[PDB]
Amino acid sequence: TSYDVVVVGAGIAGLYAIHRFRSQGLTVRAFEAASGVGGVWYWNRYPGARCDVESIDYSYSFSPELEQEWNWSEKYATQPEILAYLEHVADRFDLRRDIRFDTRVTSAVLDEEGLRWTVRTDRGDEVSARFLVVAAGPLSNANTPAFDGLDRFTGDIVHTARWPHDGVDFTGKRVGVIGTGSSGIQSIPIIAEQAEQLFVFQRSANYSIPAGDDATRAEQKANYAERRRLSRESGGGSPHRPHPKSALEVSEEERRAVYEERWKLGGVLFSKAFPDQLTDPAANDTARAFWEEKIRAVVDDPAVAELLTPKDHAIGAKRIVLDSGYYETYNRDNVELVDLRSTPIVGMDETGIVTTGAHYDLDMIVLATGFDAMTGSLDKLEIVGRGGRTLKETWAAGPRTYLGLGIDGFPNFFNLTGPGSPSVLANMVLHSELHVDWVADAIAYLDARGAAGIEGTPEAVADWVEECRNRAEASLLNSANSWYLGANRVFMPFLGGFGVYREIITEVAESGYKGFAILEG
Ligand SMILES: Cc1cc2nc3c(=O)[nH]c(=O)nc-3n(C[C@H](O)[C@H](O)[C@H](O)COP(=O)(O)OP(=O)(O)OC[C@H]3O[C@@H](n4cnc5c(N)ncnc54)[C@H](O)[C@@H]3O)c2cc1C
């Protein structure tokens, strides 16, 4: 029942945690709510689920052998391939024996005399950890929206968050998709190709750009070490940089050519084509205009194109979706886009969806749900720190951390890749590696000095909260209805760049953890 580390989650972060911590001789017990490893890549298996960041970059760097040995089948790996990859990883490093699956951690209570966390589970587990590491992921399922008479619909209801492992045949079916976030945008084109008829029920339109040899694949494998260095020192965790000159300080021909080149290689990277693209509203207007043009050129019907165009949002404010044949899908005879602002859904009946203006005969409804950002999973845990104060309570006015890694009243607790860190703003595999490594060094630091614990300082967290506030007040990611916002106004991620952030937390470590108190037994 005693372990050095308890890890919550068995996705990318938790799997690396187990490996890294055991390599320095720590005993580890991990809990995973799911049936197998993989996290988001295990749970989220709707058709066309796919990563945003090139798989060369969105993959582990910790093992030279694994990098050379594993062959990615395409530029942006789909969910089943990333799953197979993470399964291979648990196979190679014998991680599963230290994981208990189908087990949801419910509470963690600090014993302040001992500086241990007692971790409890819905399967009746009670374990004592020196260190609690939460690797619960940054994305959790947004609530299934309550529709009147959904329980009366005779056809099939399928949720993108709980996709049938053996798939769903859409052949011969009239299909209604509700939700046009990424899970919708990625599944729609596949649904339309085999469905008899597809109705897409859209509330808000989102920004999405296209996804897009043997001799060239062996070229990056030999240059992998240099590509990782660039990534670890970059702003977003990939070997890329923005243009030198400003958006509003270049030719139109040079503008179109820079946007066109950045249109090809990725959506997250298109957002950072120009330095002031996510800072100056007028600069963003150009990227917005360039995007609208491209979509009007591909969509046949100008009325549909307009409906596909996001109302009045800065491009990049919400993360740009990566699509494969999405906008082309609306040229098909068997797909109709229904504007929910004109005709809102007022309920379901036996035979389909009823809106304000028409009834829709359907055999199948696909609920393409979204994701809550950053605090969703942590919020389902009761973490009781010093004085018996929960993390939920101390975060009531917004997340407070130092570096994302320290919180006063929570010694020996580490929340990975969450509020206070770049989090989803950076390549999350490399971010996981950075954070797990940092935690492991901190533990090694404590062990070499006979110290019982480490704890965020009230002063350092206040300074960090302010630091995150300042980097964010400038950005267009800090919009009123922003994906990235917390309790209050609080923009949750660190917005200064991955390389900058990595530099900060490493120098903090090298200085003997200034801003943390080192605690004696
Ligand atoms: C379609 C899609 C594409 C994406 N593409 C990219 C990309 O290209 N680049 C990128 O950087 N990020 C991407 N992401 C973000 C993705 O969330 C992260 O990259 C990744 O999940 C981080 O891994 P993780 O281990 O931190 O979290 P997760 O993969 O979410 O793993 C967390 C695990 O913890 C478990 N857990 C949570 N709470 C508990 C509890 N109380 N008890 C037990 N277990 C618990 C969960 O079941 C889950 O298995 C994408 C997400 C989606 C949905």
Q: Report whether 354 contacts 376 (CB < 8 A).
A: no
Residue 286 exposed, middle or buried by CB count within 10 Å (0-12, 13-18, 19+) = buried
Q: How far apart are the first and last CA of the chain?
A: 20
Q: Tell me the one-letter amino acid at 251.
A: S
25: CB partners within 8 A, 6+ apart: none
H or E element in which residue 364 lies: strand 364-367
* Residue at token pair 């991680």: 95
**Under the phi-then-psi rule, with left for phi > 0, alpha for psi from -120 to 50, and beta for the rest, what region is 142?**
beta
Query: CA 100 to CA 31: how far, in whole Å?
Result: 5
H or E element in which residue 260 lies: helix 252-265
Give resolution in angstroms.
2.4
Distance 236 CA to ligand 1 centre (A): 18
Query: CA 36 to CA 10: how far, in whole Å?
Result: 8
Q: Tell me the Cα Rg of the chain.
A: 24
Query: CA 421 to CA 423: how far, in whole Å?
Result: 5
Query: CA 209 to CA 203: how far, in whole Å?
Result: 19
230: CB partners within 8 A, 6+ apart: 239
Instruction: For ligand 1, pick from 139, 326, 374 the residue to mutate: most ligand atoms within 8 Å of CB.
Output: 139
Q: Report whether 444 contacts 407 (CB < 8 A).
A: no
Query: CA 340 to CA 209: how far, in whole Å?
Result: 23
Six-digit token string for 505: 């937390």
**Which residue's CA is the closest to the ligand 1 atom numbered 19?**
428
Experiment used for this model: X-ray
Buried b (16+ CB within 10 A) or exposed e, 179-188: bbbbbbbbbb
Closest CA to 150 of 441, 365, 471: 365
* Residue at token pair 């490594």: 437
Identify how many contiguous H helices and E strands the chain contains and give both numbers.
15, 22
H or E element in which residue 454 lies: strand 451-456
Domain ranges of the chain: 1-144+372-521, 145-371
Query: CA 93 to CA 79: how far, in whole Å?
Result: 21
Distance 59 CA to ligand 1 centre (A): 13
Q: Is the dihedral of CA 68, 70, 74, 77 positive or negative?
A: negative
Distance 434 CA to ligand 1 centre (A): 16
Q: Tell me the one-letter amino acid at 396.
A: A
User: Which residues line the pocket of ligand 1, CB cutoff 6 A?
Assistant: 8-14, 31-34, 39-40, 44, 49, 51-53, 58, 104-105, 135-139, 182, 377, 380-381, 417, 427-428, 432
Q: Which residues are annotated as a binding site?
A: 13, 32, 40, 51-53, 58, 105, 180, 182, 203-204, 206, 371, 428, 483
3-state helix/strand/coil string of 223-253:
CHHHHHHHHHHCCCCCCCCCCCCCCCCCCHH
Closest CA to 413 of 456, 359, 351, 365: 456
Six-digit token string for 444: 């090694």
Six-digit token string for 486: 């917390």
Which ligand 1 atom minimizes the distance to the CA of 37?
A: 49
Query: CA 21 to CA 30: how far, in whole Å?
Result: 11
- Tally the residues of the chain: 521
Helix %, strand %, coil % of the chain (to 5): 35, 20, 45
H or E element in which residue 367 lies: strand 364-367
Side-by-side strand order, sheet with 197-202: 156-159, 364-367, 174-178, 197-202, 335-339
Query: CA 31 to CA 225: how far, in whole Å?
Result: 33
Closest CA to 130 of 151, 112, 115, 150: 115
Closest CA to 48 of 73, 74, 80: 80
CATH class of 1-144+372-521: alpha beta
Count other C-beta atoms under 10 Å from residue 451's C-beta.
14
Query: CA 237 to CA 193: how far, in whole Å?
Result: 35
Q: Which residues are annotated as a binding site for FAD?
A: 13, 32, 40, 51-53, 58, 105, 428
Q: Report whether 304 contacts 337 (CB < 8 A).
A: yes
3-state helix/strand/coil string of 34-64:
CCCCCCHHHHCCCCCCECCCCCCCCCCCCCH
